[PDB]
Amino acid sequence: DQPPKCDISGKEAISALSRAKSKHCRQEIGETYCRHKLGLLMPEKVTRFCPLEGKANKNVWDEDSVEYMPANPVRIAFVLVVHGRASRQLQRMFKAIYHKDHFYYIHVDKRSNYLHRQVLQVSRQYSNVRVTPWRMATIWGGASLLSTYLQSMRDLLEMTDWPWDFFINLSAADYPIRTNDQLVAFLSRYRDMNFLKSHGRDNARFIRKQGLDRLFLECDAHMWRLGDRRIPEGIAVDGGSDWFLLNRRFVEYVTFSTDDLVTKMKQFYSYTLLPAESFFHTVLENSPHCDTMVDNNLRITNWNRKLGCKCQYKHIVDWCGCSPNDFKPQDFHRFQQTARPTFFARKFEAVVNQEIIGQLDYYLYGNYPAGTPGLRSYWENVYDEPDGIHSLSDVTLTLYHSFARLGLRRAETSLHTDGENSCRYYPMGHPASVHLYFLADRFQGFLIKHHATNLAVSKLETLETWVMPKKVFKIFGRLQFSEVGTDWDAKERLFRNFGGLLGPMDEPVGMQKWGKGPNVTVTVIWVDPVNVIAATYDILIESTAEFTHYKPPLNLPLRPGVWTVKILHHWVPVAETKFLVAPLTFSNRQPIKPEEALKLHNGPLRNAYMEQSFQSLNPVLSLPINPAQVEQARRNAASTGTALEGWLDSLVGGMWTAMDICATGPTACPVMQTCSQTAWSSFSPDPKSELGAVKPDGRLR
Amino acid sequence: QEPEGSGGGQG
Ligand code: NA
């Protein structure tokens, strides 16, 4: 731990050094700060090459302009920067934008290995699709996103066999809102233009809100704020959206120019938050190409800052940021506007709302044939064996194992015979994959693929089980719904832990959904599995409130079992819901040992969930504490192995239902259907996301 | 319709 090369006195740098984890990161923080301290890191003045007195703002509107047929159509290089699990939606969007004359270059976040493997299958099928061999961890707001674009531009310019004319960036949450023919016709008419959208406000305020006057450093997948810095003199600084369309001539300039402007701006934006929202605007407006700028990025972005500005990236960057919302069906009319030209839109998420995606795709390229299956369903992989059980948690590993056993028990009881039961199985190994299953924008549960020995013939078989959670919400007031979960998304107003999977060390959150009406106050009560009252509080429901949520401070660990949450109005019952805190069978992915199970499953470290007690409420609410059940709960806390599995599966079976189970290959169970012939399996046909042979018109859709 | 820019200030 060597000291720094200079005295470090800035409050922001000392905070970053105290929070940094790796030695390599603390060292790089120190070097950056000390270089900036001596005035050797950032440029102070920059040459402006644009001959214009200010901005250009070229104009582009008649809807009939897009109907002509060009003799020399542009060929487009699409750069897809993607992450997450939504491979089937990316495949659907890729289908909509594909043409054999364009090119597709796909960067997958280093941390998204499952999605990368799925993208490799696409690049292997088509000669005009390639994947970036390098892969960065493009955190939100990171400096690395500009490095990604710049490197991808250099790569594309050196690909001599790909003669492209325009550069377009897209995420897995974008979708087209006009046909490929209309896009090509428009860009063929304006092929010497560049399309970037500016903020549209006071420029001095834009600089401060973006933190452009602050020095940032990306290290350990975090953006550290290290102090202040001056805006360079002599140039106009601008910015806005980091979704754009740039012609090849300007990309060449950015990549290969060695003039004062491009050199110093690449250094400046190496230490900048949200760099792609400002670097390309600032270079273009001050370069010799300034007179090619159109103040329109041809996108509709669904900004709703009342919901999207919650400083939800504070754990990733030393700043507050905002994000666009997902479109919903009521927004479809916004795609048909003709005020200005627009060809893409964001954001779309199939786990949030797929109906609007369907409306848009059929409006552009027509309905699928009658009888096409899976059009209203959605499947999303959330665990894939190649990534290993250590990428799961002890909670999800424990519960995925229990769901699989629940399916094997369904197989056994579904056969009615008086002889040997050829549907008895013994589980083998760990789950092979897990999918989320949605139907008509309603969550249906989990699909678990797993291996098991058919005991009658003594042969291994591969199966998929569908488990669905039991309904537990039970009601002229305003209350519409109530739910307990974790990872609450304040922008989309939903829990991202879709199944509500919880273990004893989780900190649950209670949510309520309200309809319109006069302001009211209600009482919330949390009850643990042996009727111990853990917390109570009132909350004001204002006449405009739509969602309320709160995370009570409950001492850990939580007693395992079925908890209850009650809502009252001046002692009058209103509604209640239930949730499961499951006991764990794994510890660091290993079978849990007695000493570990007893410390984790016997209730909080202290004898109480909060300092304040509520024992006086058990009689008023008719929640007597049974001495017998308390003793048994302590007995359960000490169990392991077989006894613990029976306790867990008893609890899961009371909150989840095994809806069906299928075999992926040959099977000896006579009542088992083949997965490819079901309507729900991840093996069943899903033509809207399937990619086949190129058609005579050069399309896949 | 709305302005662009994802930065929301220091906090
Ligand atoms: Na390829």
Author numbering:
A (entry chain A): 252 to 311, 313 to 727, 734 to 959
B (entry chain B): 210 to 220
Paper quotes:
The first enzyme in the pathway, peptide O-xylosyltransferase (XT, EC 2.4.2.26), catalyzes the transfer of xylose from uridine diphosphate (UDP)-α-D-xylose onto serine and thus determines the site(s) of GAG attachment on the core protein. XT1 and XT2 are type II transmembrane proteins consisting of a short amino-terminal region facing the cytosol, a single transmembrane helix, a stem region required for Golgi localization (Schön et al., 2006), a catalytic GT-A domain (Lairson et al., 2008, Müller et al., 2006), and a unique C-terminal domain of unknown function, termed “Xylo_C” in the Pfam database (Finn et al., 2008). To better understand the initial step of GAG biosynthesis, we have determined crystal structures of human XT1 complexed with UDP-xylose and various PG-derived acceptor peptides.
To visualize how the different amino acid substitutions are accommodated in the peptide binding cleft, we selected five variants of the bikunin-derived peptide for structure analysis (peptides 3–7). Proline can be accommodated at positions −3 and +3, where the wild-type peptide naturally adopts a backbone conformation favorable for proline.
